[PDB]
Amino acid sequence: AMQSTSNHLWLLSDILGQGATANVFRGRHKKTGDLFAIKVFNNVQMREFEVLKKLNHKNIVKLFAIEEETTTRHKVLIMEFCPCGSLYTVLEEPSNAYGLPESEFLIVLRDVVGGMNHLRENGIVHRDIKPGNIMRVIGEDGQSVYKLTDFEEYLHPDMYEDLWSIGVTFYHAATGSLPFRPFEGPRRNKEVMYKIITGKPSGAISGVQKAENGPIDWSGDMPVSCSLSRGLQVLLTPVLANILEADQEKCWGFDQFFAETSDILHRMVIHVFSLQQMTAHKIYIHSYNTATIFHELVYKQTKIISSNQELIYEGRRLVLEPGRLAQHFPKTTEENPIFVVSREPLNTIGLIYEKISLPKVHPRYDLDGDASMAKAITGVVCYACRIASTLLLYQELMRKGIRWLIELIKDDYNETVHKKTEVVITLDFCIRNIEKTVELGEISDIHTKLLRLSSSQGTIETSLQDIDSRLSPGGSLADAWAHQEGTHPKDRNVEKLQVLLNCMTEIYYQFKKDKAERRLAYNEEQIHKFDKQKLYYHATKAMTHFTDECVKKYEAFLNKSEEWIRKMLHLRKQLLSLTNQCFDIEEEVSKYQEYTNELQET
Numbered sequence: 001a002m003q004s005t006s007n008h009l010w011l012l013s014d015i016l017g018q019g020a021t022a023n024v025f026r027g028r029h030k031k032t033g034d035l036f037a038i039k040v041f042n043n044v045q046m047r048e049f050e051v052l053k054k055l056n057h058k059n060i061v062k063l064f065a066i067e068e069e070t071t072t073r074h075k076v077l078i079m080e081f082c083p084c085g086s087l088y089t090v091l092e093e094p095s096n097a098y099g100l101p102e103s104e105f106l107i108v109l110r111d112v113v114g115g116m117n118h119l120r121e122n123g124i125v126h127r128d129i130k131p132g133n134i135m136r137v138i139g140e141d142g143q144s145v146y147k148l149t150d151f152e153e154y155l156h157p158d159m160y161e162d163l164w165s166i167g168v169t170f171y172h173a174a175t176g177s178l179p180f181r182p183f184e185g186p187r188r189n190k191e192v193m194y195k196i197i198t199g200k201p202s203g204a205i206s207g208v209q210k211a212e213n214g215p216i217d218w219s220g221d222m223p224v225s226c227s228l229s230r231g232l233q234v235l236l237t238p239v240l241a242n243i244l245e246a247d248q249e250k251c252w253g254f255d256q257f258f259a260e261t262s263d264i265l266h267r268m269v270i271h272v273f274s275l276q277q278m279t280a281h282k283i284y285i286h287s288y289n290t291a292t293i294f295h296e297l298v299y300k301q302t303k304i305i306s307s308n309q310e311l312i313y314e315g316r317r318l319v320l321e322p323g324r325l326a327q328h329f330p331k332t333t334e335e336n337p338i339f340v341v342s343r344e345p346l347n348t349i350g351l352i353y354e355k356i357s358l359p360k361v362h363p364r365y366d367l368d369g370d371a372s373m374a375k376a377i378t379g380v381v382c383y384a385c386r387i388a389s390t391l392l393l394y395q396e397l398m399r400k401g402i403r404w405l406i407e408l409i410k411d412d413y414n415e416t417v418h419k420k421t422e423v424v425i426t427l428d429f430c431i432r433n434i435e436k437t438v439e440l441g442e443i444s445d446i447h448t449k450l451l452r453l454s455s456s457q458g459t460i461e462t463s464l465q466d467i468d469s470r471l472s473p474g475g476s477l478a479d480a481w482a483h484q485e486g487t488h489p490k491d492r493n494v495e496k497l498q499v500l501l502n503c504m505t506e507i508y509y510q511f512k513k514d515k516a517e518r519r520l521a522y523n524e525e526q527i528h529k530f531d532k533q534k535l536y537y538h539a540t541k542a543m544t545h546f547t548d549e550c551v552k553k554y555e556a557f558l559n560k561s562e563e564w565i566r567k568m569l570h571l572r573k574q575l576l577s578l579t580n581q582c583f584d585i586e587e588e589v590s591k592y593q594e595y596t597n598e599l600q601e602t
């Protein structure tokens with residue numbers, strides 16, 4: 001049994017979204033077989049619907065045609081089918097439980113901004129913009145494409161009794177959670193939800209009531225679990241904070257919103273890894289800005305002075321001209337960035353993350369309880385699987401940066417030998433050319449000064465070959481410990497966690513299907529119970545392997561890194577002083593090579 005039309009037909013089982021106005025079915029065309037989104041209304045239109053046909057944009061679901069059903073003669077809308085679901089469906093997956101991927105987040109912001117701007121150029125107010133009103137289509141290039149279509153938690157404080165729901169959506173897509181949540185959720189604590197919005201804190205964007213009828217934990221920054229880069233949070237926070245307060249006097253409006261959002265999307269990314277702080281970063285800088293502004297953003301994200309920023313890329317030093325535009329910088333990835341080191345001693349911090357534990361599993365056979373329990377616990381393992389791959393990246397980036405920096409130091413040492421041979425040759429060809437010619441005080445004073453030079457020049461040679469003995473294998477500065485301390489891709493730790501993650505996701509997706517069915521049979525009930533216990537042994541087995549292998553080896557590698565940083569900073573100061581002791585005596589032998597060697601006489 002199913003409904004049909006002159007051109008389309010759809011089954012009642014293939015139902016997608018179910019709402020108050022109408023329901024949307026997955027239907028096909030009678031002549032082509034192509035799939036469409038059929039909207040059948042449960043219950044002026046012929047003009048306001050044909051004006052939505054001509055609406056053609058990448059970020060808007062195309063309304064193809066309007067046909068009338070066969071049996072009920074209901075107005076049926078034929079719309080573009082988006083097989084991936086809505087943004088809410090995307091945010092339901094455990095990998096996005098603590099926030100969208102950073103690249104995926106930019107696609108959402110681009111399509112959402114690009115879609116509403118085309119609707120404002122035509123004059124359509126969306127009123128309600130939630131992850132449910134944002135569909136997802138896979139483009140011809142494999143990247144997601146988000147589209148608006150349909151035009152309690154996403155309401156303005158005055159409407160609770162336009163840019164608001166956009167700020168709630170972007171915060172939801174960035175943290176994996178809502179900005180304003182009471183204790184028992186926005187249900188019976190609905191009056192608390194309104195008291196949270198009317199608190200008008202302005203600068204703050206979050207309000208978490210972690211106790212029943214307790215306080216409201218405000219914050220102006222993103223949570224630690226945010227999977228966006230710290231450079232992206234700095235540019236995102238003021239956009240939300242200025243669109244999340246009831247004051248129209250203090251509201252931004254679309255023009256300042258569209259301007260500041262277009263500013264973010266037009267910035268390219270320069271990947272930088274602070275080798276001394278063991279921190280990776282992303283610099284959002286416009287392609288027309290100069291490298292001076294680039295060093296400014298690095299200082300605002302690492303507190304390293306701009307003049308002290310020494311850059312390494314692909315095994316060599318990197319000199320940035322202060323006027324060199326950002327679009328001419330070398331292309332960088334998260335795995336091949338620009339290592340920044342500084343002569344000033346820096347604190348070794350490492351990666352900062354929110355340390356979460358497994359929530360306990362209840363024995364109550366609750367199809368809704370087990371589902372909401374399985375969703376949070378699988379998102380925790382994803383976060384632990386996320387941090388595990390980040391710690392592995394930090395360690396492998398550390399090994400390349402250290403294995404490079406020792407070659408850059410050995411390059412500064414080899415340049416010092418070049419200036420040493422230039423002084424030794426000058427010394428010998430000037431201390432012996434005097435012996436050839438050899439009124440006595442004018443010559444004996446030279447040898448009491450030429451022999452002081454060759455003596456202090458020799459002490460440089462001894463303290464140089466000492467550094468050459470330190471930059472040798474096993475010379476109290478070898479990078480061999482980096483390969484024998486932390487975790488490696490050979491251990492395959494990220495994949496070992498990904499194995500237990502898929503089993504927990506398959507159990508979650510099954511419990512998500514078990515909740516749709518109102519009740520289960522006796523046989524299916526015991527499978528829902530047996531796999532609910534396996535969900536605990538997988539999460540417990542993963543958290544054991546995560547903390548007792550990934551974290552321990554990481555903190556052992558980091559602790560060994562902080563010591564090696566000091567021993568490296570120590571050797572750099574010596575080699576710098578030893579080279580400065582070569583330049584000032586390269587010119588001290590210049591005061592005597594032309595002095596007495598060239599007397600005056602006709």
Ligand SMILES: Nc1nc2oc3ccc(C4CCS(=O)(=O)CC4)cc3c(=O)c2cc1C(=O)O
Nearest residue numbers: 016017024037079080081082083084085089149
């Ligand atoms: N044009 C539209 N195309 C739509 O395609 C959809 C395709 C798939 C799904 C499901 C995938 C897996 S799942 O787990 O079952 C969750 C939902 C939902 C939709 C959907 O809701 C939808 C709405 C519209 C609209 O215009 O409202």
